[PDB]
Amino acid sequence: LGAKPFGEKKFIEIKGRRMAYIDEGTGDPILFQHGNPTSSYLWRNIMPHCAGLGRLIACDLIGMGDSDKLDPSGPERYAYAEHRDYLDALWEALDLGDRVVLVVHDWGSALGFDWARRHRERVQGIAYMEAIAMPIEWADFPEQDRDLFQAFRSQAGEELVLQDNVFVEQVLPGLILRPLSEAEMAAYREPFLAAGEARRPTLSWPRQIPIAGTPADVVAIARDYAGWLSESPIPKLFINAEPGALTTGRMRDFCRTWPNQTEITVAGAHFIQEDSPDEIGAAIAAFVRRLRPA
Ligand SMILES: [Ca+2]
Ligand SMILES: [Ca+2]
Ligand SMILES: [Ca+2]
Ligand SMILES: [Cl-]
């Protein structure tokens, strides 16, 4: 494993804000996108496996990692649409070209899948894991975390997350099978050390998950890329997890119907990158080598 980050953080001004990201190497991009409540740090032990296979990029979503917070922050800030506007602009500013390989997880997959559907001609391949592949129902949500997420999506959410930082301190470790080190948790809580709005992104995200028809805008967006992905011939790599968490049951059955897809199973719950980074990195690298033959 390892607690040291991959490359050095770079910064760029987007919509009057400063966003952080990792950009190492040359060639066609291999774009890694994290979800909630992580950052580019999530891919630190996976990105190395793709050394020399392309331009390795990992962006910190707005309000997360080393990216700027959006003040004034509040209940209406950090919704999917806002995150998309900033990520779209960052990805445009990075001059990615037209043969991009996406590696997505959690909210990074919702964002990545949507971007791919909108820029399909520029997508060479899609590797995904523990993703939001379609709108779901409460019965599809992981049983052990179901009540907690229903609470996030209620008035109790502010105290749980903004005051007590539950997504970072409880959910994150709770969905990783192996024990995290002091430095690893320090890296994960760093962007959220301050109580209050600094932690808003970690609360707004669960309130955006397309569950039982709400929120309607994200449900529609997910229904859109779900339908598209089920018909798209773009090569895909589905990294299934055991026991897994989000991508299980019906969603997993759905993902398994997607065309031109390779699948492997690795040990892990939700944040599988912390449990099987070498298996994941090796799979992604092989995927890319097949997509980019010499
Ligand atoms: Ca080219
Ligand atoms: Ca309940
Ligand atoms: Ca654990
Ligand atoms: Cl979430």
UniProtKB/Swiss-Prot annotation:
Q: What is its EC number?
A: 3.8.1.5
SUPFAM superfamilies, from UniProt?
A: alpha/beta-Hydrolases (SSF53474)
- How is the activity of this protein regulated? Competitively inhibited by the key pollutants 1,2-dichloroethane (1,2-DCE) and 1,2-dichloropropane (1,2-DCP).
Residues bound to chloride: 36, 107
Respond yes or no to whether keyword Hydrolase is given for this record. yes
Ranges for domain AB hydrolase-1: 29-153
GO CC annotation, single = periplasmic space
Task: Please describe, based on the UniProt annotation, the reported consequence of changing residue 36 to D/E/F/Q.
Answer: Loss of activity
Which GO MF terms does the UniProt record name? haloalkane dehalogenase activity
Q: Quick one: effect of changing residue 107 to L?
A: Loss of activity
Q: What induces it?
A: Constitutively expressed.
Q: Give the residues annotated as active site.
A: 106, 130, 270
Activity-pH behavior = Optimum pH is 8.2.
Q: Where in the cell is it found?
A: Periplasm
The UniProt entry lists the main location of this chain as periplasm
* This protein's pathway: Xenobiotic degradation; gamma-hexachlorocyclohexane degradation
Q: Which GO terms describe its biological process?
A: response to toxic substance
Instruction: Provide the reaction this enzyme catalyses.
Output: 1-haloalkane + H2O = a halide anion + a primary alcohol + H(+); (3R,6R)-1,3,4,6-tetrachlorocyclohexa-1,4-diene + 2 H2O = 2,5-dichlorocyclohexa-2,5-dien-1,4-diol + 2 chloride + 2 H(+)
What are the protein's UniProt keywords?
Answer: Detoxification, Hydrolase, Periplasm
Q: Which domain of life is it from?
A: Bacteria
Mutation effect (residue 130 to Q): Loss of activity
Q: How does this chain assemble?
A: Monomer.
The further comment given in this record reads: Is not N-terminally processed during export, so it may be secreted into the periplasmic space via a hitherto unknown mechanism.
Q: Which family does it belong to?
A: Belongs to the haloalkane dehalogenase family. Type 2 subfamily.
What's this chain's function? Catalyzes hydrolytic cleavage of carbon-halogen bonds in halogenated aliphatic compounds, leading to the formation of the corresponding primary alcohols, halide ions and protons. Has a broad substrate specificity since not only monochloroalkanes (C3 to C10) but also dichloroalkanes (> C3), bromoalkanes, and chlorinated aliphatic alcohols are good substrates. Shows almost no activity with 1,2-dichloroethane, but very high activity with the brominated analog.
Task: Give the protein's recorded name.
Answer: Haloalkane dehalogenase
Query: Which organism encodes this protein?
Result: Sphingobium indicum (strain DSM 16413 / CCM 7287 / MTCC 6362 / UT26 / NBRC 101211 / UT26S) (Sphingobium japonicum)
Q: What is the lineage of its organism?
A: Bacteria, Pseudomonadati, Pseudomonadota, Alphaproteobacteria, Sphingomonadales
